[PDB]
Amino acid sequence: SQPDPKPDELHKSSKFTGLMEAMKVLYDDNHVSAINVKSIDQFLYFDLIYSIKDTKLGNYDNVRVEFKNKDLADKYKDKYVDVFGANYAYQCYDKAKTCMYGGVTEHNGNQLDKYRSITVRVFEDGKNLLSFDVQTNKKKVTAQELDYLTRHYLVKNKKLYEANNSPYETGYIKFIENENSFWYDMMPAPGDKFDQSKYLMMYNDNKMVDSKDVKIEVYLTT
């Protein structure tokens, strides 16, 4: 449904002179993952606040999901959900609280027996040289979760974002569900700055897909 990237539409990493590590921390080993949690508070009319704890490093004790509109926050307000996504900030109104976008799926009637695998084909400058699987136990899973899994594998194995500079010039991730498909630009906007919240704001739609039918294709050009 979404048209594929037009010529020169993708972001060039060479036109980005900031620190690539900023984007790297978004898809490193650390993210927000919670199972069977209900909202506890609400700051603004398009967010929800969850008592999600950082068992890893103890950084955050509360997490604030931001949505694109109000119907999403009012939707998942009183429902027990699972949370999965990339956190970016540490704010106050004790431990601090971190923020993210979307990544909320309903719990009941959404868990699978075994781990469902999704195959990811990677194309470097045109040729399919790499292909790996990403697992999930969710019938309906956010595109943010699959994107974070894919980009995480690419972080650790192919050095997609390193601390300084990037080996890859352009790159976008493509989710194809049956007939329809959409894509996301993986490279930061040009300039010396990089706003984590503005980049991650693309996830505020809470776009979900079916793990049985979705297919993932990553396209990178050096």
Residue numbers in the entry: 2 to 94, 108 to 236
List sentences quoted exactly from the publication behind this structure:
Staphylococcal enterotoxin B (SEB) is one of seven toxins secreted by Staphylococcus aureus, and is classified as a bacterial superantigen. SEB is one of the group II superantigens, a group that includes SEC and SpeA. This 28 kDa toxin consists of two domains, domain I (amino acids 30–120) and domain II (amino acids 127–239), which are composed of a β-barrel structure and antiparallel β-sheets, respectively.
S19 was originally designed to make fewer molecular interactions with TCB than wild-type SEB, as a result of the removal of key interacting side chains. S19 maintained a similar overall structure to SEB, which is required for its antigenicity as a vaccine candidate. The interface areas between TCB and SEB and between MHC and SEB were decreased 27 or 14% by the mutations, respectively; thus, the simulation reflected the loss of binding residues. The number of simulated hydrogen bonds also decreased from 10/10 to 8/5, respectively.
